[PDB]
Design a protein around this ligand. Structure first.
Ligand SMILES: *[C@@H]1O[C@H](CO)[C@@H](O)[C@H](O)[C@H]1NC(C)=O
Ligand SMILES: *[C@@H]1O[C@H](CO)[C@@H](O)[C@H](O)[C@H]1NC(C)=O
Ligand SMILES: *[C@@H]1O[C@H](CO)[C@@H](O)[C@H](O)[C@H]1NC(C)=O
Ligand SMILES: *[C@@H]1O[C@H](CO)[C@@H](O)[C@H](O)[C@H]1NC(C)=O
Ligand SMILES: [Ca+2]
Ligand SMILES: [Ca+2]
Ligand SMILES: [Ca+2]
Ligand SMILES: [Ca+2]
Lengths: 389, 389, 389, 389
């Protein structure tokens, strides 16, 4: 029947599952039509896992693929591939037009959501199975956008974080509550709620959800949103650890003040992710990623903690480097693999590939899951963008 | 069991679902074998939706693709693609040879129909599952042809509009009634029945069907056919609104006379489409498309009304422009997505692509469905036919 | 449960279903890897129909495709494609190595059979589902070979005609009786049994099978084999009609003597096919194909009769020309589409494509089924072998 | 329910099933993106058989395919293809990153295992369905590696041989016992246990497994490991027959001493394979492969015996040559096709293709199964590596 959160598979670290690298096949002499894309993420039903991403209505090599740097356009679609299929034209499935996306399976059907339209009056449409069952219009009229990673479904309701408002100022997130793709309520996020883009979300137990977000205007600390799906409420916090997770960021521990103090820098950011261990009642361990560099989007390093991230300033504990500091690392995303016996959470890593400013842009995706005792290996792309034809 | 019409999902406007644009992948350097095609449409079972179209036994780029402007030839086939698969050779499924097509799912099996043969003695064959169960010969011996959009199945019987006769004069439509692909009766269309090509058809309630057609000889107003599937009868009308839906057309409201008065121009036309909202007993709102231009096939504009289109001359109400007037827009088609709880109707738009008179010809397909409160965005192709290799 | 012959769908003629033409996609500029092949045929389960053929371990365009004229080699395999999929590399499924093939579904599993090995000691292996369950060795040690069209399964047993012996002399056919792919008996063909290659076989009622074969040494009349699956017996006849079906052949009616008189020419031949109408008790109409030319493999013409073909010399009745006499036509094959209500038989046509003697060789496949009242249209390829790259 | 070993299909020899040869499609003019690979093997569930192999994150033709000679790198993944699909990019499924692999189906789910990481601290991860359920770290810190052929599942537990330690000295194998992908015990291999790489494993009856391995340091005789899955024990032996199966090897019978005497040469080796006939209680016949040459990896020859291979020095009995001595032959692997009535074992042959030392490297795969009475035909590739583009 309905999907709900189970206790997770035992595991005390992150180890590599797989990597997809389509543009290895886009060199001189190759015969493949690969799909350049950005903002990828994975979502799973109990039958299959799928790689979702936002394409550009074009393949590489190809004469139109010079637009792949744009964030928003009439060409972008939420597409997906079965997880493990390489990212080629024939493997691709188009779900909805739009330039911001999310998707999640509720036990019976896929829900797909994208935002579509001009910056000042965009509309989120939600697709349930084959039908568009929901529509949610822009409420601040300034780039309505969503998670760029999977949403979370519990007991037949799916929970989606949207934000609308300036990228460099106050923009308030909302939680949309959907049943069969129709928006049946909006939860107001209380507490610390002046920012919260591109949230990566996971259930922390049977009835609660925790989202790790990006503050693009005010702070190098990541906002966190917790949802109590029974009470129907959501509260925002600021991640308190001295190990600041956003990029760019100042040195560790140097933001003076309370947990929820912004600090003086804070401009810019990148979507971050986390994974966890849990029982039916509570989360027992958390796993976090951030870049090697504190000013550029390069590298990826893993950390862990058994503390509550909204109320401890202790540094996180180092797991090790998953992408060397010389390698572009951009978004990362959380997801959960439902199982019959236990569930498992994972972090995906968008290893970025680009020829430069407003030139060809795409990525390779590496996946790490909660299992084992030590980090097993770092990941590379071995794709030189100059060699892409 | 059998498919029948349900009440529709709530919705008060048209919003974009998705777009397919295969020839974005047919530029210099690309690795894809795309499928040039015309007269596309979508039909759905409860498991899957499919994009149907008439191909030319060729792919683009390719040395034989210069024939894709022809309407009828021994090369054309009704093919289909899972909806969301891009239109490439490996994704294509061939169903029947022929140069006019339709298809619909009855709850248990696909029915596929095409017309095949020389202009003066063509034969419609109907395929049910894997077998050809029905054959219907030409009765006026002058291009037997059909809807170029999905047929409608109710309680195990499927209803198909055919026409046979001169393109610039009187040609009488018939309704074929099929059970498992075998033609078990013909309903005579009474009333206004001297034309009626390329009908887009939707159930208006539990037991009635309404088709919106093209008068190619006499009128800029669109013919409408209503079928009472219980009584086994069909009656033709002329759409009465001052907002004439065909192309070319005179200015709005300027056809003098009764509802069913032709007007003085009327030569030519294009296949049009509509969508609707309904309960089990009656249709509550209708949605219509026409071109921006009143003399060329360019642009697409949406309208709506709560009036009966066969008995009111009130202008329709503007929803907005879905394809800018500078963009070729050709056929459009209706279809319905069956759901477990509710059904949903949609309009697809054939955005035409061609190098010129008797040169390479194909299209991009944009899809809008009944949902939400306002139009979300217009569609473009960003394909320049000169760049197609 | 098990497959058995049902009464057929009503139909009094042959009308076109579809055509596959992969090498339309093998011209200059094309992006497809098409599969050159020969001896194709179709076989169906109740879920799906499939196009089987013998490939050459190569695709076109390609530097190794110059071997596709060979009849037998270590490169050839029995491969298949879902019926309606075009014949490209990614759509292909390899079943067994070998250079003579057949396949049929028994209601539960596919049986696949090929002959493999050197001319003087070849072995037929039979694959049932995923396993090789049967092996049948050469008994005359001179090119053991089989039908190159589907076999027939009745009540859990499948029936396969093999021949072994000189191509220009006496070679006796056997009927192999298989259960789950294991050869459980051999039926000796009595009567007229000195030749019988490449048999096209169809059930004539609930318990009998009729095969139409090729005499390569002695006669322009086609041999016919009837199998009584209950009694476990098979008897050979010579087709008696004045309308000789093989190529080359003398003029109609000019073979003097009894039904089973060879006539003076008779050297050479081509695989022919037939279709039929039947009830559970008896065959009511037969449909036959032969070439337009009486000396070359060009064109295809349809005929019918309600007579017993082993005991009447009446000419057959003309249906019309399905492939014009200027178009190469090579093998043709019978097959049957099982249905829940009724079955349907069909003829496929191998429209040959070649650059010349021991150069590139392949084909296009056109399909006609028993339905309707008149022939609907002839078929062409519009492939010029010189344009294949 | 659970998979367990059945009695095998009757058969007294090895006959060819099929061959996959993707790089036939990688010549000048071809349109295919083929997948260069090494260490392939086949594993089957009751629904499907699959070809597994270790890829290099690249396709051929292509500018990055010059790395395909490396044994271990961050690019390699365990991928698979449905058996009979040709080895192209669109057909490929990625399961896990890593450079040593194995996989087996337990009746309900696939288990996939790879080793990943640096030479001195590699980690085996095990994937069960969609989840990584098991992790097993390196215990000798010197290239943890596994079978490169299918594992064996009996009554819900799967058995995997791993080895860790020097390639030219003593390295002790362990048997990992897995349930739903989690390592629930390790069986210590007693007896002759100082080597044992790349084991090909088959059940010998209802409760016992026999593995045929490679001694890379000490002996031209192959090690054999037997597992009693009920008692939970494993014992190593040295294959005693005078017909030494490894490459390179001295002349037959010339190793002086007991069964378990190494002999004086013994350096180097290749993965070998075997097939068998069995009842529920015991193995009745064994089938073995080795190269034609006793110093190079070229050719393949089949043998059989009804003796116990750990306790008889009798020569094996010749079946015949499956790959001529002029053709590179590298790894071979065992696998078993589960059936509803009977099981069947087979040998696959990695026919190697390479341009030379540290240049492009891949293979063709030929498959032989236990059936029939005599060998049917030898296999070739007819791929000249110089012609690969
Ligand atoms: C989940 O966690 C929240 C917050 O700690 C708690 O209030 C709630 O009771 C928990 N749910 C269960 C089922 O224990
Ligand atoms: C459907 O509409 C027709 C025409 O308005 C009407 O006659 C018929 O009764 C309706 N059907 C139902 C089930 O109400
Ligand atoms: C099928 O036909 C044969 C030959 O005419 C006849 O002997 C047999 O009785 C028929 N089978 C049935 C079930 O009528
Ligand atoms: C399988 O073989 C082993 C070794 O010969 C034997 O001990 C065991 O009893 C056998 N199993 C069965 C079920 O006979
Ligand atoms: Ca920030
Ligand atoms: Ca008109
Ligand atoms: Ca002859
Ligand atoms: Ca050795």
């Amino acid at each position: 029947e309905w999907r709900f959160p189970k206790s997770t598979c035992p595991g005390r670290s992150l180890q590599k599952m797989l990597q997809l690298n389509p543009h290895r096949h886009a060199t001189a002499g190759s015969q493949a039509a690969t799909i350049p894309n950005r903002e990828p993420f994975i979502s799973c039903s109990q039958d299959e896992c799928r790689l979702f991403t936002l394409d550009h209505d074009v393949s590489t090599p190809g004469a139109y693929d010079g637009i792949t740097w744009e964030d928003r356009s009439k060409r972008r679609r939420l597409v997906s591939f079965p997880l493990g299929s390489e990212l080629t034209l024939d493997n691709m499935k188009v779900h909805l037009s739009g330039w911001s996306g999310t998707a999640c399976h509720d036990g019976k059907e896929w829900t797909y959501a994208t935002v579509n339209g001009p910056d000042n009056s965009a509309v989120m449409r939600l697709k349930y199975g084959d039908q568009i069952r929901g529509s949610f219009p822009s409420y601040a009229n300034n780039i309505l956008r969503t998670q760029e990673s999977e949403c979370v479904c519990i007991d037949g309701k799916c929970y989606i974080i949207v934000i609308d408002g300036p990228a460099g100022g106050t923009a308030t997130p909302k939680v949309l509550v959907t049943r069969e793709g129709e928006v049946t309520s909006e939860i107001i996020v209380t507490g610390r709620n002046k920012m919260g883009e591109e949230c990566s979300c996971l259930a922390t137990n049977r009835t609660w959800i925790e989202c790790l977000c990006r503050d693009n205007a005010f702070s190098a600390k990541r906002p966190i949103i917790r949802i109590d799906t029974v009470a129907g409420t959501a509260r925002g916090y600021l991640m308190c650890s001295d190990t600041y997770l956003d990029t760019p960021r100042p040195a560790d521990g140097s933001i003076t003040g309370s947990c929820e103090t912004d600090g003086t820098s804070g401009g810019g950011g990148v979507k971050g992710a986390f994974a966890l261990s849990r029982t039916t009642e509570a989360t027992t361990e958390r796993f976090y990623v951030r870049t090697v560099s504190s000013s550029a989007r390069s590298g990826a390093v893993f950390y862990k903690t058994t503390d509550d991230p909204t109320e401890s300033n202790n540094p996180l504990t180092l797991i090790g480097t998953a992408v060397g500091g010389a390698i572009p690392m951009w978004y990362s995303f959380s997801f959960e693999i439902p199982g019959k016996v236990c569930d498992q959470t994972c972090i995906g890593l968008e290893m970025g590939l680009t020829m430069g400013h407003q030139l060809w842009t795409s990525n390779s995706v590496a996946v790490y899951c909660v299992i084992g005792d030590n980090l097993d290996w770092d990941s590379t792309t071995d794709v030189v963008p100059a060699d892409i034809v």
